Amino acid sequence: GTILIDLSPDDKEFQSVEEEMQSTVREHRDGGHAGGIFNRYNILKIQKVCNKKLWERYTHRRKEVSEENHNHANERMLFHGSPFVNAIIHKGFDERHAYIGGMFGAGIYFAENSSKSNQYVYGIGGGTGCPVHKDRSCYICHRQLLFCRVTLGKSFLQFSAMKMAHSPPGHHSVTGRPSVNGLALAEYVIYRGEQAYPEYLITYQIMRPE
Numbered sequence: 001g002t003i004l005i006d007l008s009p010d011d012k013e014f015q016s017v018e019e020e021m022q023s024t025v026r027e028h029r030d031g032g033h034a035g036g037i038f039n040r041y042n043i044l045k046i047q048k049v050c051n052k053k054l055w056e057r058y059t060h061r062r063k064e065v066s067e068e069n070h071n072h073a074n075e076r077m078l079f080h081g082s083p084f085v086n087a088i089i090h091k092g093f094d095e096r097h098a099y100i101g102g103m104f105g106a107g108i109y110f111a112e113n114s115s116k117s118n119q120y121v122y123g124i125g126g127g128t129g130c131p132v133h134k135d136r137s138c139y140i141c142h143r144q145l146l147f148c149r150v151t152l153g154k155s156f157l158q159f160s161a162m163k164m165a166h167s168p169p170g171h172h173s174v175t176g177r178p179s180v181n182g183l184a185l186a187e188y189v190i191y192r193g194e195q196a197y198p199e200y201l202i203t204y205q206i207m208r209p210e
């Protein structure tokens with residue numbers, strides 16, 4: 001079902017995805033332990049994911065959420081990093097892709113900062129790093145993450161952990177907001193796979209700083 005269409009570096013679409021990817025980078029408090037040490041990426045490839053079946057399920061669910069939220073789906077483009085990016089782009093988000101130990105329970109987690117999702121590309125805590133060198137800060141191996149369409153609808157806002165099986169009643173997602181003793185950066189959780197579509201597949205390296 002899924003077709004990958006390579007975007008050209010001169011396309012305005014490639015450029016706006018690239019800029020979001022680069023501009024939403026932050027320096028993490030773990031000193032790069034999980035995701036590596038870098039200030040920016042080398043963006044090699046951005047591909048559009050075209051799967052009609054997945055898109056239609058996504059738009060059908062988006063319609064439902066929107067009608068349940070005063071005609072506002074509250075859609076945003078958000079990043080997702082995962083060792084499962086290949087299964088995701090062919091068959092969609094399902095419960096294998098959930099982060100069970102997440103602070104808001106087993107849902108699918110998205111970030112508005114690419115570097116946050118970069119921490120999960122090789123696994124939770126960055127796992128054991130790249131398959132070839134077992135280096136969480138590998139500059140050689142090429143990484144992939146997704147820039148996704150996410151339907152948040154009416155989002156339930158939290159500053160601290162609260163483990164849930166689904167979005168609270170009358171809500172369609174949970175947003176972790178940044179706070180003093182809490183999160184450094186935002187996080188967004190959906191508990192239904194049809195509320196995200198993996199629109200862009202980004203191949204990149206983290207860059208070694210000067």
Ligand SMILES: Oc1nc(-c2ccccn2)nc2c1CSCC2
Nearest residue numbers: 080081082099109110111117120
């Ligand atoms: O992009 C992300 N991915 C994952 C993740 C976790 C387990 C399996 C697959 N992905 N977690 C988070 C983010 C970004 S928001 C913080 C949590």
Ligand SMILES: [Zn+2]
Nearest residue numbers: 130133138141
């Ligand atoms: Zn490597």
